[PDB]
Amino acid sequence: PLGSQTTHELTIPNNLIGCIIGRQGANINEIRQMSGAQIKIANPVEGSSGRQVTITGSAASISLAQYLINARLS
């Protein structure tokens, strides 16, 4: 659905972003594939403590993507 599509944003602590991405981006690929959401990692900035992530899709797929991000960090 076209009317369901929206955008969300969150911040991953820097020490955790490598886990989210994974080897060759395998982890973030999996989260994208499972959730059906588009997930983009923001350009890194020097001396930040967190890395921004945008998630676009329906509310359901964004909620799933967030859940999977959390699960990956356990």
Residues 56, 59: Cα–Cα separation, whole Å: 9
Which helix H or strand E contains 8, and what residues bound it?
strand 6-13
- Collapse the DSSP code of 53 into the 3-class scheme (helix H, G, I; strand E, B; otherwise coil) and give the result: strand
- Domain ranges in the chain are 1-74
Specify whether domain 1-74 bears CATH 3.50.50.60: no
Q: Resolution (in Å) of the shown entry? A: 2.1
Residues 65, 34: Cα–Cα separation, whole Å: 8
How were these coordinates obtained? X-ray
Give the CA angle between residues 48, 8, 43 to the nearest 5°: 35
Residues 71, 49: Cα–Cα separation, whole Å: 21
Q: Which residue has the tokens 């009317």?
A: 3
* Nearest Cα residue to 31 out of 64, 73, 74: 64
Whether residue 36 contacts residue 60, with contact meaning beta carbons closer than 8 Å, is answered with no
Residues 16, 55: Cα–Cα separation, whole Å: 17
